[PDB]
């Protein structure tokens, strides 16, 4: 197993941990803030995924400082993860194209 494939796997594991802890911490941060909707675990997990993917429908979002901080860690974990898979795919295409030119 090559470095870029293990990093991708690692990144996917890590992002899943971030998604989970983000659900837990987002609820812990937003309860206590009147009007907040990000306050039960299942839908927080959905919110963390749609945040990590940068979709952002708008059905659920944090309104507190610490919930926004948690939000940012999720987004950056998401963008870095999905970017690292792209970097990994590129190393694969590039090695296969060195081979196919006899380098």
């Amino acid at each position, epitope marked *: 197993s090559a470095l870029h494939w293990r990093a991708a796997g690692a990144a996917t594991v890590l992002l899943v941990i971030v998604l989970l802890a983000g659900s837990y911490l987002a609820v812990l941060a937003e309860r*206590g803030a*009147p009007g907040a909707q990000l306050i039960t675990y299942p839908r927080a997990l959905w919110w963390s995924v749609e945040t990590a993917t940068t979709v952002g429908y708008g059905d659920l979002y944090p309104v507190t400082l610490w919930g926004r901080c948690v939000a940012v860690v999720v987004m950056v974990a998401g963008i870095t993860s999905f970017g690292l898979v792209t970097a990994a795919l590129a190393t694969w295409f590039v090695g296969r194209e060195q081979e196919r030119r006899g380098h």
Partner: antibody
Amino acid sequence: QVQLQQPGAELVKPGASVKLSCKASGYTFTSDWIHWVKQRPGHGLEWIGEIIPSYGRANYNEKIQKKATLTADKSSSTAFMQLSSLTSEDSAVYYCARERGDGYFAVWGAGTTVTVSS
Amino acid sequence: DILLTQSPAILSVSPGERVSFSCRASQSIGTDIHWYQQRTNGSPRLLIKYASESISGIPSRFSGSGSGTDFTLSINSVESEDIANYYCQQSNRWPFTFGSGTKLEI
């Protein structure tokens, strides 16, 4: 099984304080919230506050005079509610309830009847 | 905070008839409403969760419907064990709030 065990009664002199307890059994998860609900005789249900015992954070009903302080003891699976400086407005039945973090009170304690009198 | 209105306060029905309790929320709460029953000298009991989902141990007699702001708890064929106060409660926005109660009366 009985999943929440509360004492039946507490007499409290006006101005004094008292610490209600609520021992939980059954399944206990890190995600568990314990809620406290005040009901005055012939009135309805009034949400007082909530605590997450695995972390110790508590949030309170803003709309009513803060009479409560919530704590938990992770070792004994017991949640406490400290009601301080009571008047006859504070005489009521106080339930605790367990909420798995998904929004509803699946199980309730039998309630503790608090009487403020001399 | 979300205000839950339960009107009427008392509901008179004849045995075997079908009865319906209304819960109106002051703004849209999707389906995040739950129903409790409290008999004289009892503690509340979850009857229905998330507007319509069944709880195990609750007679099939009870059902729920509704979304958004208007919600209904129904009893197909009332009987005397159903005499009690019925409360709704939302979990869509912090803090959780309770309806004011409807007494069933036969």
